[PDB]
Design a protein around this ligand. Structure first.
Ligand code: MN
Ligand code: MN
Ligand code: NA
Ligand code: NA
Ligand code: NA
Ligand code: NA
Lengths: 121, 121
């Protein structure tokens, strides 16, 4: 069976892009548009990987990771950052992030990053 | 004057190997051990060719290429990949990579690849 990816971004266009391309690549995809929804879906649907926007409404990406860590939950996490919004990757490691991708990104870039992370496990 | 090669790998032994052999072959060599250092050296020292490890700390090889491309910078780039970590060369072309070499590699292989790339320019 297909691996399941939870895609989380508040920009609808980014979610649509990610879902289309990852489904084409043979993954099952579920989505969230805010951090509260994301945390609930992670806890319940147990995705194999989470693609998570850093700047998110309700609970931001840092907070989502922090709450997962507090629950002792470990997910492969690809963090998405905006142009010229540098992220502290040492903090990211504290939070359980596994990799980072900046926006904009191409279909092949995201496919490559997700594949590499899924292989590392 | 000698052509200048920027060699970037987080394994010290690989950097030492590359520097020794390329200097012997008549190149000037500068080095970096993470992607942040690599990007800074590329932007500042303007090497004639970059030998770049795909799996790099701070900024990985994809990210280094992506940032160079965003700055409109064009460098001849030889990407280094690990054993059984296949890389998407169509993505590589998007990123400006010119050639690929797997690890482990011999002194003559790297000398040949660098020579061919420098000739293509
Ligand atoms: Mn956002
Ligand atoms: Mn490496
Ligand atoms: Na929803
Ligand atoms: Na993780
Ligand atoms: Na250094
Ligand atoms: Na290039």
């Amino acid at each position: 069976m297909n691996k399941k990816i939870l895609v989380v971004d508040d920009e609808e266009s980014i979610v649509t892009l990610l879902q289309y391309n990852l489904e084409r690549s043979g993954y099952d995809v579920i989505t969230a548009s805010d951090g509260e929804e994301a945390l609930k879906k992670a806890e319940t649907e147990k995705p194999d990987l989470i693609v998570l926007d850093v700047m998110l409404p309700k609970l931001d990406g840092i907070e989502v990771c922090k709450q997962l860590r507090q629950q002792k939950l470990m997910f492969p996490i690809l963090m998405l950052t905006a142009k010229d919004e540098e992220f502290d990757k040492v903090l990211g490691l504290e939070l359980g992030a596994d990799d980072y991708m900046t926006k904009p990104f191409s279909p092949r870039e995201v496919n490559a990053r997700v594949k590499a992370i899924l292989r590392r496990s």
